[PDB]
């Protein structure tokens, strides 16, 4: 009768109408005589401990909630597949791109950074775009965003950035004062601030936005030659955005606009698609780059590094159970198959450690046993062993020590990583005084036109109006360093707001 | 502007003289640098010897604790309780022992279905939980903004919460589930009528009443027991908001209640609530037309007049929201001598439910958290080692009872009241009970024409998205309540469809 | 060769000699190229975060320890089956006894009460005998002991008893001072103390001891008539015991004597067997019992309540992985199928609440999805849809609320429990003087002969010699109340020891 | 009266005879009326959920156990102080060594590696010697052992070594087969094996053994000049050991021999003492060392690197609660104050990451709020925020992001580390074919005499007799590579044993 997002239970009943309803069992499978009333001493007496069904149900209900992700809590998920359309075997030996036509199952989670589990979808926020590839050589987690860059470039400032973006520790209120204080004290965030406050900041659903790995990745081919690559997945449905008033109205109407849109589009046969590209940079070009090639704030221009098509991402399956397949899913950037490796990108290096720790915290030590996280296209044969909530044979009676003389699993020499000589001094290097203005200026002048610049300035001024006077002055100084037109228009809008 | 916006300026001015403290790690080792990571060369990989980076990242990775399964979105405050009248005849508890006895309190305001990132101004019953720090230990009065509840049997609470919350597959709200449960359980008609009225969306936490909603037993020094209700009525006046204003406030600031409470407390506008009771004797409990322990039944003020007890004043904001509001736990089983529980099935179920979820959400030793500590009581027992054992594990005291070495001893005075019951211990079907007359009286007498019209409009607006047969069942229940109720609701639904 | 326990890895290698050694993978299935050395900059340089395999394996190593059971930590497990031999369908309608010859899979765990995971098997301690039945009506957990009785009779004293049996809170040393202080202050433990310090207190392996449910259970047949029953499983291998010197010597030589003995006996075709009996008591007989029929410190004499054979317990399978099948197993006495229910036995009522709580703490909220704990002979269907490490499909998109109009699982009236009318007053009743002497006197006089009495007195005196003078005097007073011969022999031995 | 280890409770009662016994309260401080009987309807009725005190007590008892340490589970603890006796300010700028006479509180935990919680003290095992210093610059954890060296030299093999030392995954029994298989496949463990099977392998209590940091630590003085140092704490009570028969007898009598000995010695005014030494090595000597100066299997001879006294360790206080002060204590080697830093020792680098992870696992994310782990001699201010069991004010309303313009805590420039130029290709370097024989040979010939070598061979043969033939042959080949006398004596003893 209605759209698929509301007829879920009617569809379930139609699907399971011929068969009889299952009997009501306890946790241990004991059938339940009654589940409407509790055992009491007469009509008006106290409760009995002997109500094992009540105790079981109440205890399980008391433990429903697991810790939410520290970032990207609110999200929507889907399942699909990946198809290779062109040969990039000259760059990487990974089995994902081994030949043309090789389908590969994938899982995708869309999310917002600062939004909590009960927040609205249509808000001004960078969007999370996490893709998991189920491959015969284990799982590969491409955890990207809807933006090629990020706010900061050094890992130790990520918790401070998240704290500044989140609620005030005392009042529990979202605070543009902290937001703009951090943004002005770290001027490298100007590029991402411009990207977020442009019209692309509030996309019209998850099907109308691009995805970027944002990191330079290392591709090793069969000969051992290594190149540096970027990852872009571009939507085939077209880029579409929403206005501020429309975003606020959608937020007040339905906070789950993105989830509902994705669910309906998938259930109506309107499968969203993304085209997979790469940008390959050689070692020589990495040495001769005008900036740091591994800088998270920098992009690679399309003129010197043209996009090369690789494959296509199609999402064609809604999650059966949201908690089972979306809430419990974990993306580990360290999960990289042979042929793809990490670069000296400091942010990526920090992410290599950050994610498994929080996954063990919020999902348990054995979270890789969860079906959505399992590499079911492979076998996990190693010397890892006993853990909390270990529902596996625990690899049976196999030896749990290595090396051994009893035919236990053995390492494969071909999986050894690429080696690069690194010369220098092991110390902390100050990098806040780097170049932060030229790419932002190029984006503002060349990429943006008059109306988009006006909208960007209006959005920045509207968000910054609630900050303190000196914070606004510092932000204005940064914007003026970017461009005098930027700074002057922002100052004028702020002055009329005051 | 508001003090909440000027929080950091206030914090800076609070020192105004002291230089910034040194930056230490978790173990107190001073930090040489906290802006850059240790790398080999300008463009090299990270090194594991960055102990400060590993510590900060690991602590950041574990910042989130599980949210409460219900009443997740909350606002808290601290204050005190003052006794204004003598009710020592009914109860011997030291909270009401004498007039003028100040007593520290802590309260939390919350919404039932609202998750952590949700808007305050939403049509939802409001949580009003009060904790009393008393020399006889802590007392948790976990009330609501309504004198009643939707259901009356404990085993249906998880089903009700599931129906109120997201769809398991689509993760979307389902009025289909909400109204299916409401129509299949007609006892929720009274609370539904209360919620879909003007009082459903209050204008801040300072403009709503609080109700324990349960019949409690008061035992005096002689052992004579009575049944009592608890009402705390706002002295600031009852204030409500329209649906358009509620939606606009939700779109503007989801934390309107938190901000309003914070500003009112910080501006010297301390909210107050007047404490009352409704005492019922044993015989009147036998002569009550309905079940006196029914959660869907109130006691009319004509036969059970309100009698003032004290006043609740909130005059302090939380210093740290996570430390004093997120980590606070309210256990209804925490009852001092002189107050006990009744055979109210819902209360009996809560007595077991709350400590379990507190041990899950905060940890086995959650009573060692400062906000949950009974710092007016000298705790001494035989409970021992647990995860994050905190204070002293009670030292070298014997950990078994009884013993011959002067370990803590039970005192006979704290013995509970003894009442005899007769009957067969079995499950009793109590869904066919009376559910109509109190709702009918509230609709006809308490409300007027415009309030009934608004109530019907709100119910129709919420119910229009349900399926046809669910709407028909709900309409039949409303017609059973009153033909005019049912007919107006059905007309509005037909216009909506 | 040697015992099969020592040849485990040789057997494993012989079994897996016809198959290629598995490749070494990470947690996510990524193949490992070098698991012998860490990534270092140069030969003598610092470690780099890039060792994703090192971090993952070390993190899993850091979390392999789950909390040990608060009691019965040291354990040995086995798997087998239960065969019905006779007809008891007149007493209970449970499908576990429905027909003759109906095989039923079982799992058992043998344990000591006060022993930790690192302690010796051959010590003086009541032995745990927990049996799990996998039945089409869900799992049934018969959690018995090697003694028909217990130390106490009121559940609020169980933590105090365990504390007195365990280490001193300050010195972390065993304290017979606290042991005998609690024993003397609780005279009801005299029967259990006599049983424990008799010859059968130190059994020679788990195959040479009996098992007792120790509780009166309610059996409901198809007509609704309810009787009270006991459960006895008697070893077919014979009752064999060990001396104090031999027990100490075996403890010194090998702390895992029981585990090794059970493993070798099962692996050598020496399947241990236990014969299953019941002791049925009617409502009128319970009303006319000389003592409390529900008292945990009282037995039912075989003359008035003859044992009726039911079936046989055979163990014929060793655990494949000890942690997976013995450490992670959980026995819930509340897991009772229809036809068997609990009695007003206060200890049993307390256990009904105690066990699931500690299981959720020790394993986790979803511990029933662990394969050893799954009711794989039952089709579980309920409305519990959440949990840390949700491992099945979370029952898909089925409605999570009850009642409903969409064909969700429904309760069946046939599982409704038995109802009795209990008259009285709801209050605490002091029950410390329920004739704690007559059964102990009867046992000591009739069951034990002169040499066994002498050995029992020697054992009690040897254990009590380290207590204080007043504690010894109180214990001697209790033993004299039991019998003057008991008291005089114990006091003479104590005076010789002091 | 007996010794304090048994008169604990009597002394506790004597200390509190002149005060009324405290009332019995619940967890929330509500007084308890009756903690001896449960509330039941009538004399013989079912239990009722109204027993809030019973539910609280049972629930807290059900969660009494925390996960045991993956290694060094069985332990004994004590508290004392550290006194500086000489001037080492030229090597390090640490305030712990700042000047002479500076008393400093310390905490010490003694433990066995493979021993589990319920295991005997007198067992052949390397002994743990962990020292925590409470200083004004935070806590310093010197986590050493009773041996200057270790079994292996590469971090990734530590879990395999622990698995080989611990119980069989299937039979849950100890396996000398696994032990000697790992030992023979890793010949670098020969030095440590000789040390462990020498006479000092089973010390007579914790007061009669030395302690070694075993790692080369780097000391930075005020000028930034860095040196490499070792740490030795040598007992002033004398080195005393026990025979195999005596160790077995002590194990069968009392498994807590070490704990009891330490407790009695401290309570009787017999304070044990250890003298603090260092071995300083310069950069040039490290470059010219015949072996790897950072190798965990190599020592520094006293002729070239003489010991230089620093201070004294005195333990003069028993714990007042074993769980509160010994079980909950956590030692983090990364907790190093300014003036002391780590070296490129791979094992130390691995420990720096390993320890905090397992501490957060087994004690909770906020385990530094536990009083024994708190740095109460230093003031703590940082941007770490909300966690489970936040047992402090959570630093109030201070800003939770850095940098900021509101006077939040600031980094101290003088605490910056020492930078050393490091060159070489970032890759895994094999460390198995290194030199593993000459130091063991020197120890065997010079340090050991005839009877000591005979005892060492007897002990090794007694342990190795139960291994397989090929494992024994490989071990014999390793011992022959060490010395022909070693190999021939071991093989002759093995042939006599078989
Ligand atoms: C069988 C019936 C009920 C059950 C099983 C139940 C269960 C729960 C649970 C599990 C929590 C979470 C506590 C926490 O996470 O800290 C909670 C909180 C709460 N409940 Fe209930 N509840 C029931 C009925 C009621 C009733 C009748 C009222 C009011 C009259 C009520 C008012 C509240 C409030 C205000 C909170 C907020 C606690 C806080 O702010 O920390 N609930 N309840």
Give the DSSP letter string of D71-112.
Answer: S--SEEEEEEEEEE-S--TTT---TTSSSTT--EEEEEEEEE
> What are the angstrom distances between the C-alpha of D207 and each of B110, C108, D238, D317?
58, 44, 8, 14
Alpha-carbon distances of C209 from B465, C79, C306, rounded to whole Å: 66, 17, 20
Distance, in Å, from the CA atom of C276 to the CA atom of C280, rounded to the nearest integer, reads 13
Q: Are A77 and A326 in contact (CB under 8 A)?
A: yes
Residue span(s) of chain A under CATH 2.40.180.10 come to 66-149+201-374
- What distance in Å separates residue A33's CA from the closest CA in chain B? 10
Helix (H/G/I), strand (E/B), else coil: B427:
strand
What DSSP assignment string belongs to B193-258?
A: HHHTSGGGSBSSGGG--EE--S-EEEE-TT--EEEEEEEEEESS---B--HHHHHHHHHH-TTHHH
Task: Please name every residue paired with C110 in a beta bridge, in sequence order, or none if there are none.
Answer: C76, C129
Binding site as annotated, residues of C for heme: 355
Q: Which fold has domain B149-199+435-497?
A: Hemocyanin, N-terminal domain (1.20.1370)
Strands (DSSP E) contained in D375-461 are 420-422, 425-428
Distance CA A75, CA D481 (A): 62
CB C432 within 8 A of CB C188: yes
Neighbours of chain B (3+ CB pairs under 8 A): A, C, D
Closest in C41, C170, C249 to D322, CB measured: C170
The reply to whether omega before B353 is within 30° of 0 (cis) is no
Containing H/E element for B425?
strand B424-427
CATH number, domain A1-65, options 3.90.79.10, 3.30.70.520, 4.10.91.20, 1.10.10.60: 4.10.91.20
How far lies D476's CA from each of D442, D447, D465, D479, D481, in Å? 19, 21, 12, 5, 9
Tokens read off for B52: 């400060």
Cα distance between residue A434 and residue A419, in whole Å: 28
Tokens representing A419 are 């080696």
Report the SS3 class of residue B457. helix
Does residue A355 contact residue A333 with C-beta atoms inside 8 Å? yes
**Residue C147 C-beta-side C-alpha neighbours within 13 Å:** 28
Helix or strand (DSSP H, E) at A227 = strand A226-235
φ/ψ of B216, rounded to 5, equals -110, 155
Give the HSE-up count for residue A156: Cα atoms under 13 Å, Cβ half-sphere.
23
Taking Cα atoms as reference points, which of B455, B354, B429, B463 lies closest to residue B187?
B429
Among residues C81, C22, C72, C53, the alpha carbon closest in space to that of C331 is found at: C72
In three-state secondary structure terms, B489 is helix
DSSP string, A311-340: EEEEEEE--SSHIIIIIS----TT---TTE
What's the gap between Cα A392 and its chain centre? 29
Distance CA D274, CA D235 (A): 4
Token couple for D153: 């030299």
Own/partner long-range contacts of D479-484 (Cβ < 8 Å, ≥24 apart): D479/D190, D481/D187, D481/D437, D482/D190, D482/D194, D482/D437, D482/D440, D482/D441, D482/D444, D483/D441, D483/D444, D483/D445
Identify which of C466, A64, D402 has the alpha carbon closest to the alpha carbon of residue B56. Answer: D402
Contact (CB, 8 A) for B311 and B273? yes
Residues of CATH 2.40.180.10 domain(s) within chain B?
65-148+200-373
What is the rounded (10 degree) CA torsion for D460, D464, D465, D467? 180
For the segment(s) B1-64, the CATH number from 3.40.50.1370, 3.90.1480.20, 4.10.91.20, 2.70.50.30 is: 4.10.91.20
Dump the DSSP string for C166-226: S--TTT----HHHHHHHHHH-GGGHHHHHHHHSGGGSBSSGGG--EE--S-EEEE-TTS-E
Residue D139 · residue D376 · CB < 8 Å: no
Q: Is A30 annotated as ligand-binding?
A: no
Q: How many residues does chain C have?
A: 498
Name the 3-class secondary structure at B56: helix
φ, ψ at C485 (rounded to 5°):
-65, -45
The top-level CATH class assigned to B65-148+200-373 is mainly beta
CA B127, CA B125: separation in Å to the nearest integer?
Answer: 7
Query: D152: which 2 tokens?
Result: 């292996």
DSSP assignment of C323-380 equals: IIIIIS----TT---TTEE--S-HHHHHHHHHHHHHHHHHT-TTGGGSGGG--TTS--
Decide if B159 contacts C401 (C-beta within 8 A): yes
The H or E element that residue A218 is part of is strand A217-220
Of B274, B275, B278, give the one whose Cα is nearest residue B235.
B274
H or E segment to which residue D317 belongs: strand D308-317
User: What does the alpha-carbon distance between residue D229 and residue A103 come to, in Å, rounded to a whole number?
Assistant: 58
Nearest to A286 by CA among A420, A187, A472, A407: A420
Distance B331 CA to ligand 1 centre (A): 9
The pair of three-digit structure tokens given for residue D491, joined into one six-digit string: 């093989």
CA angle B339, B342, B344 (to 5 degrees): 140
SS3 B299: coil
Strands ordered across the beta sheet of C420-421 = A39-41, B424-427, C420-421
Long-range contacts, stretch B267-272, CB < 8 angstroms, 24+ apart:
B267/B3, B270/B79, B270/B313, B270/B314, B270/B315, B271/B205, B271/B206, B271/B234, B271/B235, B271/B236, B271/B313, B271/B314, B272/B234, B272/B235, B272/B236, B272/B311, B272/B312, B272/B313, B272/B314
- Whether the CB of A64 sits within 6 Å of ligand 1: no
Residues D383, A159: C-beta atoms closer than 8 Å: yes
How many of the other CB atoms lie within 10 Å of CB of D156? 22
Task: Report, in angstroms and rounded to the nearest whole number, the Rg of chain D calculated over CA atoms.
Answer: 26
Helices in D139-273 by DSSP H: which ranges?
A: 158-165, 176-185, 190-197, 244-253, 257-267
Q: Where in chain B is the domain with CATH 4.10.91.20?
A: 1-64
What secondary structure letter does DSSP report for B396?
T
Helix (H) or strand (E) holding A217: strand A217-220
Class of residue A270 by CB neighbours under 10 A (exposed 0-12, middle 13-18, buried 19+) = exposed
Q: What tokens appear for B126 in the block?
A: 């409001």
Dihedral of the alpha carbons of D30, D31, D37, D43, in degrees to the nearest 10 = -80
A415 touches C24 (CB < 8 A)? no
Query: What is the enclosing helix (H) or strand (E) of C142?
Result: strand C138-145
d(CA D399, CA A164): 9
User: Cβ-count burial of C289 within 10 angstroms (0-12 exposed, 13-18 middle, 19+ buried)?
Assistant: middle
Could you give the 3-state DSSP secondary structure of residue D210? coil
Q: Which residues of B330-351 are buried (b: 16+ CB within 10 A; e: fewer)?
A: bbbbbbbbbbbbbbbbbbbbbb
Cβ contacts of B325 within 8 Å, gap of 6 or more: A172, B74, B75, B76, B108, B318
Q: Say which residues have a Cβ less than 8 Å from residue D78's Cβ, sequence separation at least 6.
A: D107, D108, D262, D266, D315, D317, D318, D319
* C-alpha to C-alpha distance for C334 and A192, rounded to whole angstroms: 58
As a whole number of angstroms, the distance between CA D428 and CA A63 comes to 45
Q: What radius of gyration, in Å, describes the C-alpha atoms of chain C?
A: 26
Q: Distance between CA atoms of C194 and C442, rounded to whole angstroms?
A: 12
Q: Are B351 and B150 in contact (CB under 8 A)?
A: no
DSSP H/E element including B352: helix B345-361
Q: Give SS3 for D11.
A: helix
Q: Which of D315, D134, D289 is nearest to D211 (CA)?
A: D315
**A486 vs A478: CA distance, rounded Å:** 10
Which three-class secondary structure state does DSSP give residue C247? helix
Quote the distance between the C-alpha of residue C392 and its chain's center. 28
| CATH of the domain spanning A150-200+436-498, picked from 1.10.357.10, 2.170.150.20, 1.20.1370.60, 3.40.190.10 | 1.20.1370.60
What are phi and psi for residue C389, nearest 5 degrees?
A: 55, 60
**Residue D161 and residue D169: Cα distance in Å, rounded?**
14
d(Cα C318, Cα C325) in Å, to the nearest integer? 10
Tokens of A162: 């998240």
Residue D42 with chain C: CB contacts under 8 Å: 422-426
The pair phi, psi for residue C103, each rounded to 5°, is -70, 150
d(CA A411, CA A234): 38
d(CA A267, CA A15): 15
Q: Provide, as residue numbers in chain C, all residues whose Cβ is less than 8 Å from the Cβ of B426.
A: 417, 419
Tell me the backbone φ, ψ of residue A31, rounded to 5 degrees: -65, 145
Handedness of CA D383, D389, D391, D392 (dihedral sign): positive
| Per-residue buried b or exposed e for C183-204, using 16+ beta carbons within 10 Å of the residue's own CB | bbbbbbbbbbbbbbbbbbbbbb
D477, D487 contact by CB (below 8 A): yes
Residue pair A101/A83 in contact by the 8 Å Cβ criterion = yes
Residues of A in contact with B350 (CB under 8 A): none
**Rg of chain A on CA atoms, in Å:** 26
Query: Max CA-CA distance within chain A?
Result: 86
Residue B373, classified by CB atoms within 10 Å of its CB into exposed (0-12), middle (13-18) or buried (19+), is middle
Question: Are the C-beta atoms of residues D237 and D248 closer than 8 Å to each other?
Answer: no
How would you classify the pairing of strands B210-211 and B339-341? Answer: unpaired
DSSP assignment of D153-180? SSGGGHHHHHHHHS--TTT-S--HHHHH
Nearest CA in chain C to B178: C401
Alpha helices in C225-321 (DSSP H): 244-253, 257-267, 283-287
Phi, psi of C422 (to 5 degrees): -105, 120
Whole-angstrom Cα distance, residue B240 to residue B123? Answer: 11
In contact, C370 and C328? CB cutoff 8 Å: yes
Contact B56/C58 with Cβ under 8 angstroms? Answer: no
Domain limits, CATH 1.20.1370.60, in chain B: 149-199+435-497
- Measured CA to CA, the distance from residue B309 to residue B315 in angstroms comes to 20
Return the CATH number of the domain spanning residue range C66-149+201-374. Answer: 2.40.180.10
Lookup result for tokens 């004498």: B98
Q: Which numbered atom of ligand 1 lies nearest the CA of B345?
A: 1
**Among D489, D473, D431, D497, CA closest to D194:** D489
CA distance C439 to C450: 18
Nearest CB to A387 within list C13, C63, C413: C63
Give C181→chain B minimum CA distance, Å: 7
Q: Do A421 and D424 touch (CB under 8 A)?
A: yes
Contact of C225 with C203, CB cutoff 8 Å: no
- Residue C300 neighbours by CB under 8 Å, 6+ apart: C230, C279, C281, C293
Instruction: Please count the residues of chain A.
Output: 498
8 A C-beta contact, residue D60 and residue C176: no
- Give B81 Cα–ligand 1 centroid separation in angstroms: 22
Q: The tokens 């008033």 sit on which residue?
A: A245
**Nearest-atom index, ligand 1, CA of B295:** 27
Which residues have CB under 8 Å from C257's CB, separation 6+? C120, C121, C122, C205, C250, C251
DSSP code of residue C299: -
Instruction: Say if the Cβ atoms of B73 and A118 lie within 8 Å.
Output: yes
Structure-determination approach: cryo-EM
Write the DSSP string, B59-83: HHTT-PPPPPSS--SEEEEEEEEEE
∠C223-C224-C225 over CA atoms, to 5°? Answer: 95
SS3 A25: strand
CATH 4.10.91.20 domain locations along chain A: 1-65
DSSP per residue over C391-417, as a string?
-S-TTTT---SSS-SS---B--GGG--
Distance CA D244, CA D249 (A): 9
β-pairing verdict for B38-40 and A424-428: antiparallel
Instruction: Report the separation in Å between the CA atom of D45 and the middle of ligand 1, taken as the mean of its atom positions.
Output: 30
Quick one: how many helices (H) and strands (E) in chain B?
Answer: 14, 13
How many other C-beta atoms can be found within 10 angstroms of the C-beta atom of residue D15?
Answer: 11
* Helix, strand, or coil (residue B38): strand
User: Is C59 within 8 Å of A384 (Cβ atoms)?
Assistant: no
Under 8 Å between Cβ of B175 and B463: yes
- Count of Cβ atoms closer than 10 Å to residue B102 Cβ: 11
Tell me which residue in A6, A48, A346 faces B176 most closely, judged by beta carbons: A6
3-state secondary structure of B370: coil
The conformation of residue C446, written as its DSSP 8-state character, comes to I
Q: Where does A166-305 have alpha helices with state H?
A: 176-185, 190-197, 244-253, 257-267, 283-287
- B123 closest CA partner among B298, B281, B242: B242
Decide: A422 and D425 in contact? Cβ < 8 Å.
Answer: yes
Domain with CATH 1.20.1370.60 in chain C: 150-200+436-498
């Amino acid at each position: 009768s209605r759209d698929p997002a509301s007829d879920q239970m009617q569809h379930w009943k139609e699907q399971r109408a011929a068969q009889k309803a299952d009997v009501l069992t306890t946790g241990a499978g004991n059938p339940v005589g009654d589940k409407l009333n509790v055992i009491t001493v007469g009509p008006r007496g106290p409760l009995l401990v002997q109500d094992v069904v009540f105790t079981d149900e109440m205890a399980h209900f008391d433990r429903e909630r697991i810790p939410e992700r520290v970032v990207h809590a609110k999200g929507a998920g889907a399942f699909g597949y990946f198809e290779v359309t062109h040969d990039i075997t000259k760059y990487s030996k990974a089995k994902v791109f081994e030949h043309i036509g090789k389908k590969t199952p994938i899982a995708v989670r869309f999310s917002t950074v600062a939004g909590e589990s009960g927040s609205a979808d249509t808000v001004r926020d960078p969007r999370g775009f996490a893709v998991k590839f189920y491959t015969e050589d284990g799982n590969w987690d491409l955890v990207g965003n809807n933006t090629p860059i990020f706010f900061i470039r050094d890992p130790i400032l990520f918790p401070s950035f998240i704290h500044s973006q989140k609620r005030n520790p005392q009042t529990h209120l979202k605070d543009p004062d902290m937001v703009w204080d951090f943004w002005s004290l770290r001027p490298e965030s100007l590029h991402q601030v411009s990207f977020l406050f442009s019209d692309r900041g509030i996309p019209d659903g998850h099907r109308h936005m691009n995805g970027y790995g944002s990191h330079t990745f290392k591709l090793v081919n069969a000969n051992g030659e290594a190149v540096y690559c970027k990852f872009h997945y571009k939507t085939d449905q077209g880029i579409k955005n929403l206005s501020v008033e429309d975003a606020a109205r959608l937020s007040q109407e339905d906070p789950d606009y993105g989830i509902r849109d994705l669910f309906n589009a998938i259930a109506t046969g309107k499968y969203p698609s993304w085209t997979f590209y790469i940008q390959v940079m050689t070692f020589n070009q990495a040495e001769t780059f005008p900036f740091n090639p591994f800088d998270l704030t920098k992009v690679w221009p399309h003129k010197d590094y043209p996009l090369i098509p690789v494959g296509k991402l199609v999402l064609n399956r809604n999650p059966v159970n949201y908690f089972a397949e979306v809430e419990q899913i974990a993306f580990d950037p360290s999960n990289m198959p042979p042929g793809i490796e990490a670069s000296p990108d400091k942010m990526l290096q920090g992410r290599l450690f950050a994610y498994p720790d929080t996954h063990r915290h919020r999902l348990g030590p054995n979270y890789l046993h969860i079906p959505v996280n399992c590499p079911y296209r492979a076998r996990v044969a190693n010397y890892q062993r006993d853990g909390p909530m270990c529902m596996q044979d625990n690899q049976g009676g196999a030896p749990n020590y290595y090396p051994n003389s009893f035919g236990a699993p053995e390492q494969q020499p071909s999986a050894l990583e690429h080696s690069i000589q690194y010369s220098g001094e092991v110390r902390r290097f100050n990098t806040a005084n780097d170049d932060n203005v030229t790419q932002v200026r190029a984006f503002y002048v060349n990429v943006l036109n008059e109306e988009q610049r006006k909208r960007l300035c209006e959005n920045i001024a509207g968000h910054l109006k609630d900050a303190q006077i000196f914070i606004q002055k510092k932000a204005v100084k940064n914007f003026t360093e970017v461009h005098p037109d930027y700074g002057s228009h922002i100052q004028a809008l702020l002055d009329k707001y005051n």
